[PDB]
């Protein structure tokens with residue numbers, strides 16, 4: 001797939017990247033921004049393990065054939081409105097290990113066919129809503145954030161989920177609103193995963209803040225509405 005030259009691309013291959021077929025690999029090369037001149041036939045784009053602190057609006061608009069986008073292990077503190085809107089063929093998106101605190105409300109809306117969404121190891125304090133409408137998701141990773149609860153009904157349209165990673169969040173099990181997540185895990189133990197170089201089925205991966213007991217085992221009697229924020 002790498003022909004040993006860069007003649008297949010009108011703009012050549014971006015500096016400090018490698019190009020192989022429709023794969024553009026810019027990993028681990030101290031990039032502080034997305035490199036210019038990424039080939040528009042690109043299907044897989046590796047931008048992970050760099051020092052990207054921000055994305056310019058529109059930076060990906062030309063990459064209409066992109067299937068997989070890896071932005072993990074950068075220093076993203078925010079995302080621009082609409083930054084993924086052109087990527088309507090995208091099936092894998094990795095935003096893990098950044099510094100994201102909030103996301104634009106509609107940031108995932110045009111990724112109607114997304115299959116795998118990885119957002120571990122950020123600073124998220126609430127579920128990005130409308131992950132709710134990503135009905136083709138098989139993989140959802142929210143582990144090691146600061147999530148306290150899941151809005152009632154948030155996962156109910158995700159009928160293709162096979163792998164959910166929720167480990168390492170301070171789930172607020174004293175608050176009676178936890179019961180949606182409690183019941184959802186108990187109903188979906190088969191898809192409760194933790195990662196150890198492979199997917200491990202572990203229904204106790206989601207645990208309560210403080211007590212570290214399994215979220216799925218919470219009793220409604222132990223909860224209270226007045227312990228909610």
Ligand SMILES: [Mg+2]
Nearest residue numbers: 007008009010
């Ligand atoms: Mg040429």
